[PDB]
Amino acid sequence: DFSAKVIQGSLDSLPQEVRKFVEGNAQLCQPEYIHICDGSEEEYGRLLAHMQEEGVIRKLKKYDNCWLALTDPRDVARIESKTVIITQEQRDTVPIPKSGQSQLGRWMSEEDFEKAFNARFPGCMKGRTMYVIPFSMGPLGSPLAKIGIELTDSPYVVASMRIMTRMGTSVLEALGDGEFIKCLHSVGCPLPLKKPLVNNWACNPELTLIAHLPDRREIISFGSGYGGNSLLGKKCFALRIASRLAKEEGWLAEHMLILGITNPEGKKKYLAAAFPSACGKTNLAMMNPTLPGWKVECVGDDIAWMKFDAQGNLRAINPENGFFGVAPGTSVKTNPNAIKTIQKNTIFTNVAETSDGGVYWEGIDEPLAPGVTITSWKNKEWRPQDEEPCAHPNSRFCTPASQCPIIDPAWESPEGVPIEGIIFGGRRPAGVPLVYEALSWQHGVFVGAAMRSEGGIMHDPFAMRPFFGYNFGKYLAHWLSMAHRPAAKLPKIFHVNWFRKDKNGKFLWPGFGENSRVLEWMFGRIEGEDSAKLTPIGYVPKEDALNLKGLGDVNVEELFGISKEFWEKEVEEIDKYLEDQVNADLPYEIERELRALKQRISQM
Numbered sequence: 307d308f309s310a311k312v313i314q315g316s317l318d319s320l321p322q323e324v325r326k327f328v329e330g331n332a333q334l335c336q337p338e339y340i341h342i343c344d345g346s347e348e349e350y351g352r353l354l355a356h357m358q359e360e361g362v363i364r365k366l367k368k369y370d371n372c373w374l375a376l377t378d379p380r381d382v383a384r385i386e387s388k389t390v391i392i393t394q395e396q397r398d399t400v401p402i403p404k405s406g407q408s409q410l411g412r413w414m415s416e417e418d419f420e421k422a423f424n425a426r427f428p429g430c431m432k433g434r435t436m437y438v439i440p441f442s443m444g445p446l447g448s449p450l451a452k453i454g455i456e457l458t459d460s461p462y463v464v465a466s467m468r469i470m471t472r473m474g475t476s477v478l479e480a481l482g483d484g485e486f487i488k489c490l491h492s493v494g495c496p497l498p499l500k501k502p503l504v505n506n507w508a509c510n511p512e513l514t515l516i517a518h519l520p521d522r523r524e525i526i527s528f529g530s531g532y533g534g535n536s537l538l539g540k541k542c543f544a545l546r547i548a549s550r551l552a553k554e555e556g557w558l559a560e561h562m563l564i565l566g567i568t569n570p571e572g573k574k575k576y577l578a579a580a581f582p583s584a585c586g587k588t589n590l591a592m593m594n595p596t597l598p599g600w601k602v603e604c605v606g607d608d609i610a611w612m613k614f615d616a617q618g619n620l621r622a623i624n625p626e627n628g629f630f631g632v633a634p635g636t637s638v639k640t641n642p643n644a645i646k647t648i649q650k651n652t653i654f655t656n657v658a659e660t661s662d663g664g665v666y667w668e669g670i671d672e673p674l675a676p677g678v679t680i681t682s683w684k685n686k687e688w689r690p691q692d693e694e695p696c697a698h699p700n701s702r703f704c705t706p707a708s709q710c711p712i713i714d715p716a717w718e719s720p721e722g723v724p725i726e727g728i729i730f731g732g733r734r735p736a737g738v739p740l741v742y743e744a745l746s747w748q749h750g751v752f753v754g755a756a757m758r759s760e761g762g763i764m765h766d767p768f769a770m771r772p773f774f775g776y777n778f779g780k781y782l783a784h785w786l787s788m789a790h791r792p793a794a795k796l797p798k799i800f801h802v803n804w805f806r807k808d809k810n811g812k813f814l815w816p817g818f819g820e821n822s823r824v825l826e827w828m829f830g831r832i833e834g835e836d837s838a839k840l841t842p843i844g845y846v847p848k849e850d851a852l853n854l855k856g857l858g859d860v861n862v863e864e865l866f867g868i869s870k871e872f873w874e875k876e877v878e879e880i881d882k883y884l885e886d887q888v889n890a891d892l893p894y895e896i897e898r899e900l901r902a903l904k905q906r907i908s909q910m
């Protein structure tokens with residue numbers, strides 16, 4: 307009975323199973339206090355002032371209610387090598403690669419995880435508050451939403467979870483005696499500190515471990531205070547645990563933005579798009595379109611949960627409540643919609659601070675008034691001349707989604723939005739056209755399976771490489787199975803590449819807002835317009851089908867050129883990759899698409 311240690315709320319008012327989860331872990335971790343979060347502005351405002359007084363965060367005096375946290379340089383990112391999924395059988399979690407280690411996940415035995423847990427959690431919250439965060443992933447009470455409870459000893463996690471999820475008393479009220487995902491987090495620095503605290507940022511890099519136990523609906527994370535390791539709704543819940551549940555239950559949990567696009571005729575369509583890192587995701591989600599009379603609005607910028615409704619529509623929700631975006635590169639010039647979003651009520655992590663109490667980072671493209679100086683994310687004076695960057699490359703804004711000037715009016719609709727197109731993206735200086743369209747659902751799944759990360763060297767199928775909750779081959783089979791659902795209205799699948807270059811190393815396409823022109827083509831293709839030419843790789847825009855008005859001389863022949871020798875090498879590369887990494891778990895349909903593509907190229 308830990309009743310005597312409760313400093314907000316009451317163990318008595320919690321649902322039975324929630325109380326068991328709290329108390330059981332209070333027994334294990336030995337926190338000094340238990341704070342049951344209410345999600346109120348009062349609670350939030352006071353928690354921030356507290357962190358401020360303690361030096362954990364600084365207030366950003368130039369803005370309305372914005373804050374800056376600077377971490378221990380050892381704890382600056384989601385850490386893949388410490389991220390594991392626990393299942394009875396390794397093969398259910400990752401395929402067995404022909405040689406070496408899987409690139410598609412990282413399994414740990416139940417036995418090894420048990421030893422790891424015992425080595426970390428007993429007594430780990432001594433002298434700290436355990437916060438109890440009741441949170442909804444997705445609009446509160448939506449049939450597509452799922453509830454979690456996160457226990458944490460980090461006020462930073464509490465504040466960031468309030469922005470990134472729906473959290474507080476109303477969630478407990480909606481949960482009742484229902485099922486929830488159990489989320490346990492600790493920074494792993496019980497008091498009295500065994501080791502020096504760096505930058506007022508509690509962490510334990512040596513023992514950092516982020517574990518997922520899908521059969522137990524548990525996520526357990528130790529030693530990192532940061533982002534994807536500590537905000538458990540984001541990746542651990544909404545991709546890793548969720549993709550497994552989606553597999554079980556017949557839906558999809560994906561690393562996709564969701565956008566709503568309206569043509570000049572006022573007709574609106576929703577599209578989902580998966581991109582690997584540095585391939586253009588945030589710029590597309592926040593697009594300020596250049597074509598007159600087009601509108602682009604954002605439902606979500608990172609994760610999508612999608613489920614076919616009774617009518618066969620693939621309905622998607624954004625399970626998040628906020629944007630947890632990479633700050634560097636967010637440009638006042640070319641990403642105005644992100645910039646507007648983050649002007650108030652935003653928590654920044656590891657960015658630079660200007661002497662007038664503003665934020666700064668590489669690629670902001672905003673000259674400072676003469677006189678204004680810059681303090682780096684390492685708390686050192688900094689000048690544009692310097693060797694090291696002023697902001698960590700993985701530094702972040704954490705901002706409420708409702709503040710996005712282009713947030714879609716249906717971004718919280720409980721039944722989700724009807725997805726009519728899915729886009730897979732990449733970054734290839736050569737050989738891959740600006741846009742092409744899959745020949746079929748099965749071809750589309752192959753195209754997602756063949757995705758590469760920036761530069762085209764490494765594979766990031768479906769932009770899910772770090773995030774698969776289970777065996778990737780089985781994931782492909784799951785996608786392929788959607789085709790056999792009666793009445794399913796299967797979205798059209800496209801692949802985009804903003805980054806193709808000419809022989810000089812210059813981009814052949816201007817991109818950014820100009821990508822509205824590619825959306826226009828996709829939109830028309832969904833409506834059944836005859837604006838496509840068949841090629842060995844799929845459909846591409848016909849001559850003159852793209853609106854190039856205003857762009858001057860665009861070399862569409864090169865931008866859309868398909869080379870036999872390039873595509874021969876590409877098919878051989880995909881073949882090798884799928885054999886090595888997926889092998890016995892590769893679906894028949896995928897192998898069949900590989901053979902079909904190889905054959906179409908061979909006839910060039």
Ligand SMILES: Nc1nc2c(ncn2[C@@H]2O[C@H](COP(=O)(O)OP(=O)(O)O)[C@@H](O)[C@H]2O)c(=O)[nH]1
Nearest residue numbers: 581582583584585586587588589804813817818
């Ligand atoms: N040439 C070109 N560059 C782009 C485009 N979209 C984004 N970028 C650049 O590519 C990099 C990554 O873009 P970003 O949208 O941050 O990628 P994300 O990591 O997938 O969100 C940044 O340097 C952007 O300026 C585009 O349409 N064309």
Ligand SMILES: [Mn+2]
Nearest residue numbers: 587588607631
């Ligand atoms: Mn993003």
Ligand SMILES: [Mn+2]
Nearest residue numbers: 561607608609
């Ligand atoms: Mn992401």
Ligand code: NA
Nearest residue numbers: 376377505506
């Ligand atoms: Na700090």
